[PDB]
């Protein structure tokens, strides 16, 4: 397939696919380096501005994959033209961290901060160095420090939430996800994650909040089945708890039964695709019947 | 149609002038890009900008947020005991704009005096060709524009339709005004008329002229705004239909795995 | 309709203005090639703009609500600046051929 | 498809230029003869209009973008798995690195 | 409950976060409505165009009666601005 793939492509499509990969910031270092070094030996003629980003991406992938030789090969090419560039310094520091002797990388970051006071990338890389070197508490403190000094980056908020997830701190992650959702209200993914975080907390009021947040993002995309499943189980759990009112429990049963029918239709519309989908449809059917009998 | 002209004056005046103004505009745009220099930004001002953006985003998107957390945000901003905006105070520069003077200045400044450099170019071009007839404009004109239009031909019986090179280039300036953006893009800075006028998107959007006053203004704006949980209305989706998830699910089969 | 993206709106407006200026530029060349009076020329320019707007509406057809919120910019947009650039190319080839 | 439209636009522009040259020759002949205040032939005028209408059809097709107004549709396919990873924080400590180290 | 069978229960064992607050501090109720000063500001912004006429009169008298490119261009944009502001009066009227 390697020769077959290399045959039925052109350099334009390959470059466009690499640009799309950059846009989707996926983790495909193997394929990135596979298509990276191939276009560096086949075309190697024009598109300098594109090929510099390509060089950096290929070296980033090679740092992940297995190959420091190509990483240094692209590093010398990057250093040839721009003698003083802080991005290349950051990249070299990252590779140095990957190899050994983290302290000289820290010193390089310190010098970079001494030159340019406003360098978020170097501080982020130092925060990541102490995420893996020491405990996550100190890294959390420093990430909070940098975030307080900026209060600009959404990636910092999401990283803080991710690090707080491992510490079973849903109270602070709740605020993190609330802030990250406030800036982007049309992104249903953050709403779904916030609903899951609030559901994990527990409590009937938190259950209702998570249910409503599940149902809000359910109409923005109208296809995510994780949120619909979470809403159905939130309604079932509300029904289970004795501390409830008659009409609220009634409407919760209606919500759960409606979600069950939507599940049934979603799985029945997939049965005409293949011939093994009928069996999975049966399986989810027994699941829903058991849950319906138990709820009723 | 009269005044039979030579075929040598059209190939030595029209084309040269057109190319001259085209390349002058392009050169002006490129030089404007080259001369653009960055402005130094200090960390405290950056933080002030980010806090302003945060408060503005809270003002805009405040419906899809829990009431308890919204009140916690608003208290943190207001906080009558300490107050972030109340205590944090930077240096203040003495102002000078006044109500009536600035209300008038809004029009006094304007862009009134931005035509003179083009007039200089037109004057040089007209100086080069003293007695010349470039073209005629089909649009009928009044005889009171002839002094400005001809400006160098001694003719009182002739109509004002026949224009000189000065007005020819003057109309050439605005003829390609919307054509320059066609090859460059929406943000075009090749306008020959506005030479000295700086036209750009603008480095460093945030301009906290008086940090304290902006702090107080945002403090009162956040006190004025109310809270209306737009999430409380979930019953509209309750009674509905789900057919779009049937929608591209049909069109999600057709794509395989690379 | 609740949430709107400025990038798509800007792109739509840019495309609309680009076609409006190109059609106007060619309308100027046609009138300069033929050669008419001012009243007839202005009427012809208006007719060309109307034809361009009709073709632009025909281009969208269905599902136009998602593309354009309204239709006022489609009908009335770039009528003065487009005329300013059309008058140039009208007289550019008018006197080049006839007078010269 | 875009190449066909571009070629059609070019052909129409060439036809328009040829019609302009024909009209110029007609007026040059007219200046030779006294009086005879007649108009240019209607056939070349119709050719000019045909070249004008054809070139205005591809000029609209060449630049058609018409992006969707709603901001939810582009992120309707994007998965949270890709969003979970970020380009700022990348820890270079994985089992694949030591698995790919020998080879 | 035994009804759900599979139910995983997850427990949780200096104030640096600005948002996460230890004390809940509810009981916020603000009722401030000053329509008089808002009406006063809206009454005066619509008076600016009226006061923008006398200075244009002064600069028109200043141009004189010499037919030239500069005075003609000054007059051409002097009436264009009111017309261009007249083309979108409906939106600001609704506002």
- Residue E72's alpha-carbon distances to A273, B146, E60, in angstroms, are 74, 13, 10
Which residue intervals of chain A are DSSP H helices?
2-7, 11-24, 29-42, 48-64, 68-81, 86-99, 102-115, 120-133, 136-150, 154-166, 170-183, 188-201, 204-221, 225-240, 246-269, 277-295
Dihedral sign computed on CA atoms, order E2, E8, E13, E19? negative
* Residue E45: both structure tokens together: 């912004």
d(CA E75, CA E66): 12
Residue of C19, C21, C99 for testing the chain B interface, max B β-carbons within 10 Å? C99
User: To which residue do tokens 């008419």 refer?
Assistant: C36
**Shortest CA distance from D75: residue in chain A:** A187
**What 3-state class would DSSP assign to B45?**
helix
Please count the residue pairs, one from chain A and one from chain D, whose beta carbons lie less than 8 angstroms apart. 66
Q: Which residues, other chains included, contact A286 with Cβ-Cβ below 8 Å and sequence gap of 6+? A: none
Residue A66 CA from chain centroid, whole number: 23
First to last CA, chain D: 47
- Tell me how close the Cα of E87 comes to any Cα of chain A, in angstroms: 34
**What 3-state class would DSSP assign to B194?**
coil
Burial code (b: 16+ CB inside 10 Å, e: under 16) for B4-38 equals: eeeeeebeebbeebbeebbebbeebbeebeeeeee
d(CA C65, CA C55): 17
First to last CA, chain B: 70
d(CA D26, CA D41): 9
**What 3-state class would DSSP assign to B163?**
strand
- Residue A94's alpha-carbon distances to A88, A98, A102, A272, A287, in angstroms, are 10, 6, 9, 50, 49
Contact C69, D71 (CB under 8 A): no
- Residue C10's alpha-carbon distances to B77, B118, C6, C75, in angstroms, are 35, 31, 6, 18
3-state secondary structure A29-44: HHHHHHHHHHHHHHCC
- E–D contact (≥3 CB pairs within 8 Å)? no
Contact A262, A206 (CB under 8 A): no
Q: Which residues, other chains included, contact E69 with Cβ-Cβ below 8 Å and sequence gap of 6+? A: B115, B119, B122, B148, B170
Burial code (b: 16+ CB inside 10 Å, e: under 16) for D36-61 equals: eeeebeeebeebbeebbebbbebbbb
Contact B194, B114 (CB under 8 A): yes
Contact B95, B212 (CB under 8 A): no
For residue B162, list its beta bridge partners.
B136
**What 3-state class would DSSP assign to A50?**
helix
DSSP string for D38-57: -PPPHHHHHHHHHHHHHHHH
First to last CA, chain C: 56
Contact C81, C20 (CB under 8 A): no
- Residue B236's alpha-carbon distances to A221, B36, B240, in angstroms, are 15, 53, 7
Q: Which of B75, B103, B147 sits opposite E25 (nearest CB)?
A: B75
Q: Which residues, other chains included, contact B93 with Cβ-Cβ below 8 Å and sequence gap of 6+? A: B209, B210
Structure letter (DSSP) for residue B5: P
Find, among A240, A225, A232, the residue nearest to A210 by Cα. Answer: A232
User: To which residue do tokens 């298509």 refer?
Assistant: A35
Strand pairing class (B135-136; B162-163) = antiparallel
Q: Which residues, other chains included, contact E95 with Cβ-Cβ below 8 Å and sequence gap of 6+? A: none
Q: Apex CA D46: angle with CA D44 and CA D51, to 5°?
A: 95
* Residue A62: both structure tokens together: 């090679």
Structure letter (DSSP) for residue B4: P
d(CA E19, CA A179): 9
d(CA B40, CA B204): 9
Contact B244 A262 (CB under 8 A): no
Centre a 10 Å sphere on the Cβ of residue C93 and count the other Cβ atoms it contains. Answer: 20
Helix or strand (DSSP H, E) at B136: strand B135-136
The CB-based long-range contact list for B2-7 (8 Å cut-off, 24+ gap) reads B3/B133, B3/B162, B3/C99, B4/D31, B5/B133, B5/C99, B5/C100, B7/C100
Structure letter (DSSP) for residue D2: H
* Residue C84: both structure tokens together: 């300013």
DSSP string for A106-154: HHHHHHHHHH-S--HHHHHHHHHHHHHHS-HHHHHHHHHHHHHHH---H
Question: Strand locations in chain D, DSSP E?
Answer: none
For residue B136, list its beta bridge partners.
B162
d(CA C24, CA E68): 30
Contact C21, D70 (CB under 8 A): no
First to last CA, chain A: 54
**What 3-state class would DSSP assign to A232?**
helix
d(CA B217, CA B207): 15
Contact B178 C91 (CB under 8 A): no
d(CA C9, CA C27): 27
Find, among A197, A194, A174, the residue nearest to A185 by Cα. Answer: A194
Helix or strand (DSSP H, E) at C85: helix C81-97
Q: Apex CA B42: angle with CA B39 and CA B45, to 5°?
A: 105
Helix or strand (DSSP H, E) at B172: helix B165-175
- Which chain C positions have a beta carbon within 8 Å of D69's beta carbon? 1, 4-5, 8-9, 66-67, 69
Contact A151 B237 (CB under 8 A): no
Contact A236 E4 (CB under 8 A): yes
d(CA A251, CA A206): 17
3-state secondary structure E24-56: CCCCCCCCCCCHHHHHHHHHHHCCHHHHHHHHH
Dihedral sign computed on CA atoms, order A29, A33, A39, A40? positive
- Tell me how close the Cα of A8 comes to any Cα of chain B, in angstroms: 13
Contact A66, A82 (CB under 8 A): no
Contact A32, A57 (CB under 8 A): yes
Please count the residue pairs, one from chain A and one from chain B, whose beta carbons lie less than 8 angstroms apart. 61
The CB-based long-range contact list for B202-209 (8 Å cut-off, 24+ gap) reads B203/B36, B203/B38, B203/B39, B204/B39, B204/B41, B206/B45, B206/B48, B206/B49, B206/B52, B206/B53, B208/B45, B208/B48, B208/B49, B208/B52, B209/B93
Contact B106 E30 (CB under 8 A): no
Method: cryo-EM
Question: How many residues make up chain E in this entry?
Answer: 95
């Amino acid at each position: 397939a390697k020769v077959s793939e290399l045959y039925d492509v052109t350099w334009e499509e390959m470059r466009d696919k690499m640009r799309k990969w950059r846009e989707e910031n996926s983790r495909n270092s193997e394929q990135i380096v596979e298509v990276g070094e191939e276009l560096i030996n086949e075309y190697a003629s024009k598109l300098g501005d594109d090929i510099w980003i390509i060089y950096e991406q290929v070296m980033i992938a090679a740092l992940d994959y297995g190959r420091d030789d190509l990483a240094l090969f692209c590093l010398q090419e990057l250093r040839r033209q721009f003698p003083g560039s802080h991005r290349v310094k950051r990249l070299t520091g990252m590779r140095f961290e990957a190899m050994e002797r983290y302290d000289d990388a820290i010193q390089l970051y310190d010098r970079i901060l001494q030159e340019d006071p406003t360098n978020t990338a170097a501080r982020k890389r130092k925060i990541a160095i102490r995420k893996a070197q020491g405990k996550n508490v100190e890294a959390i403190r420093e990430l909070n420090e940098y975030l307080e000094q900026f209060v600009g980056d959404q990636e910092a908020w999401h990283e803080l939430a991710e690090l707080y997830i491992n510490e079973h701190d849903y109270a602070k992650a709740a605020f993190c996800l609330e802030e990250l959702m406030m800036t982007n209200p049309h992104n249903h993914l953050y709403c779904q994650q916030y609903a899951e975080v609030k559901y994990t907390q527990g409590g009937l009021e938190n259950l209702e909040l998570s249910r409503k947040y599940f149902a809000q993002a359910l109409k923005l995309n109208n296809r995510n089945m994780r949120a619909l499943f979470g809403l159905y189980m939130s309604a079932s759990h509300i029904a289970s708890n004795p501390k409830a009112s008659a009409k609220t429990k009634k409407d919760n049963m209606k919500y759960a039964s409606w979600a069950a029918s939507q599940i049934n239709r979603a799985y029945q519309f997939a049965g005409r695709s293949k011939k093994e989908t009928k069996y999975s449809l049966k399986a989810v059917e027994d699941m829903l019947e058991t849950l319906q009998i138990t709820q009723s | 149609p009269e005044l039979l002209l030579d075929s040598n004056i059209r190939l030595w005046v029209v084309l040269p002038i057109v190319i001259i103004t085209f390349f002058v505009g392009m050169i002006r745009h490129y030089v404007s890009i080259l001369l653009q220099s960055d402005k130094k930004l200090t960390q405290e001002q950056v933080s002030d900008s980010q806090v302003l953006i945060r408060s503005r985003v809270l003002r805009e998107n405040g419906k899809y947020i829990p009431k308890q957390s919204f009140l916690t945000r608003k208290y943190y901003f207001n906080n009558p005991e300490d107050g972030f905006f109340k205590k944090t105070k930077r240096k203040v520069v003495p102002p000078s704009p006044m109500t009536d003077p600035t209300m008038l200045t809004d029009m006094m400044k304007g862009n009134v005096t931005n035509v003179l450099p083009m007039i200089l170019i037109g004057g040089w071009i007209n100086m080069t060709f003293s007695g010349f007839v470039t073209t005629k404009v089909p649009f009928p004109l009044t005889l009171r524009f002839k002094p400005m239009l001809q400006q160098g031909i001694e003719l009182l019986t002739l109509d004002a339709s026949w224009v000189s090179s000065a007005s020819w280039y003057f109309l050439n300036v605005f003829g390609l005004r919307s054509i320059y953006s066609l090859i460059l893009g929406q943000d075009n800075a090749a306008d020959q008329s506005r030479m000295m006028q700086e036209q750009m998107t603008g480095a460093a959007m945030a301009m906290p002229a008086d940090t304290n006053k902006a702090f107080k203004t945002e403090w009162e704006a956040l006190e004025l705004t109310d809270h209306q949980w737009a999430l409380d209305d979930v019953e509209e989706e309750l009674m509905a239909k789900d057919l779009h998830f049937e929608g591209m699910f049909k069109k999600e089969l057709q794509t395989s795995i690379f | 309709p609740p949430f709107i993206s400025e990038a798509a709106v800007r792109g739509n407006a840019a495309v609309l203005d680009y076609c409006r200026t190109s059609v106007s530029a060619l309308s100027g060349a046609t009138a300069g090639i033929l050669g008419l009076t001012g009243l007839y020329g202005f009427i012809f320019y208006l007719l060309a703009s109307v034809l361009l707007s009709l073709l632009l509406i025909l281009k969208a057809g269905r599902r136009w609500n998602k593309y354009f919120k309204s239709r006022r910019p489609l009908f009335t947009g770039g009528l003065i600046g487009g005329l300013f650039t059309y008058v140039l190319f009208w007289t550019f080839l008018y006197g080049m051929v006839h007078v010269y | 498809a875009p190449s066909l439209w571009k070629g059609l636009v070019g052909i129409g522009l060439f036809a328009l230029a040829h019609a302009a040259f024909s009209a110029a020759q007609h007026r040059s002949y007219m200046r030779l003869t006294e009086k005879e205040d007649e108009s240019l032939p209607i056939d070349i005028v119709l050719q000019t209009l045909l070249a004008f209408a054809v070139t205005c059809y591809g000029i609209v097709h060449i630049a058609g973008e018409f992006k969707d107004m709603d901001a939810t549709s582009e992120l309707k396919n994007k998965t949270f798995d890709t969003l979970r990873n970020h380009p700022s924080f990348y820890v270079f400590n994985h089992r694949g690195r030591v698995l790919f180290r020998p080879s | 409950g035994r009804r759900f069978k599979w139910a995983i229960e997850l427990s949780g064992p200096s104030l640096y976060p600005v948002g996460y607050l230890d004390k809940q501090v509810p009981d916020t109720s603000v009722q401030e409505t000053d329509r008089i000063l808002v009406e006063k500001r809206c009454w005066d912004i619509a008076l600016g165009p009226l006061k923008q006429i006398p200075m244009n009169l002064f600069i028109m008298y200043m141009a004189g009666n010499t037919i030239s490119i500069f005075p003609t261009m000054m007059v051409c944009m002097m009436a264009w601005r009111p017309i261009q502001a007249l083309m979108a009066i409906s939106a600001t009227f609704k506002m």
